[PDB]
XYZ file of C-alpha atoms in Angstrom:
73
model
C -13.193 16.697 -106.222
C -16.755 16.582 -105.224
C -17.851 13.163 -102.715
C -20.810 11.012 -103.224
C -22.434 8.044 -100.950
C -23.254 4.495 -102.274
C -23.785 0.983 -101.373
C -23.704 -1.204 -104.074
C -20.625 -0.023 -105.808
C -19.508 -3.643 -106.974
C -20.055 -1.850 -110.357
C -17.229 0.264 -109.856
C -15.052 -2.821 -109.251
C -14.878 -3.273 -112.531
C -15.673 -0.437 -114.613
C -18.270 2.413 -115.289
C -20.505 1.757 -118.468
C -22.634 4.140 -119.406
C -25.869 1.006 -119.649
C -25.212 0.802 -115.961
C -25.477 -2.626 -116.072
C -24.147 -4.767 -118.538
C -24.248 -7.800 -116.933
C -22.876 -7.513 -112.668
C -19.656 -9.044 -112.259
C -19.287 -12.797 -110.849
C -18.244 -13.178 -107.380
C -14.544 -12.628 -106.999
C -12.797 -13.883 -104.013
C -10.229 -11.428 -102.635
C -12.171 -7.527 -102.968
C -14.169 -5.881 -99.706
C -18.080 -6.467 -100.739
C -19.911 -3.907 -99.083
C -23.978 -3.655 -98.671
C -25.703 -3.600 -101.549
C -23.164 -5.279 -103.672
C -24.786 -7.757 -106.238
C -21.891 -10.622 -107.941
C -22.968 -13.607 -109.803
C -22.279 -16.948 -108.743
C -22.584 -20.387 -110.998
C -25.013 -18.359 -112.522
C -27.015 -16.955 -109.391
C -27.106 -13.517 -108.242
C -26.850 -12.429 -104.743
C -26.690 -9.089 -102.444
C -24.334 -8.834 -99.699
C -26.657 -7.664 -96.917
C -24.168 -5.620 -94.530
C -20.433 -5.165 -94.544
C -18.443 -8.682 -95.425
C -15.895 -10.153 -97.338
C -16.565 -14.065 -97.941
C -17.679 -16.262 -100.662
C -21.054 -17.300 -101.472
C -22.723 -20.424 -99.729
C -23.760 -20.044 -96.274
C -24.971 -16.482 -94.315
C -26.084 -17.663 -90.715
C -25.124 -14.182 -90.293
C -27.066 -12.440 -92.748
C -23.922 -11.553 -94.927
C -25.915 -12.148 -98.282
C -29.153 -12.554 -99.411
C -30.032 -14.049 -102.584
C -32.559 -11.946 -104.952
C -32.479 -14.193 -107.868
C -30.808 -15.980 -110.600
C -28.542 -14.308 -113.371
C -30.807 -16.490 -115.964
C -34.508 -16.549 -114.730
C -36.739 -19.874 -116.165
């Protein structure tokens, strides 16, 4: 079959709704996160900036980036 480039393809971690959303998974410890990648976390939402596998908390390598909450105020 045919071959297609991506980033973010934490979508496909799970599975491939046709609303393309549905609510991104939570962060789950244990599955390569590569660039682009969005999880939610204690109800947050960040974007792993390059390739890395690690838990949300602490990037003083730039291995996430926070874009915003998973329920905004």
């Amino acid at each position: 079959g045919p071959s297609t480039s991506m980033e973010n393809l934490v979508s496909l971690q799970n599975l491939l709704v046709y609303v393309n959303w549905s609510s991104y998974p939570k962060y789950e410890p244990g599955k390569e996160y590569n660039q682009g990648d969005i999880v939610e976390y204690n109800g947050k939402l960040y974007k792993a900036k390059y390739w890395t596998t690690s838990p949300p908390s602490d990037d003083p390598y730039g291995s996430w980036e926070y874009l915003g909450e998973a329920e905004p105020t």
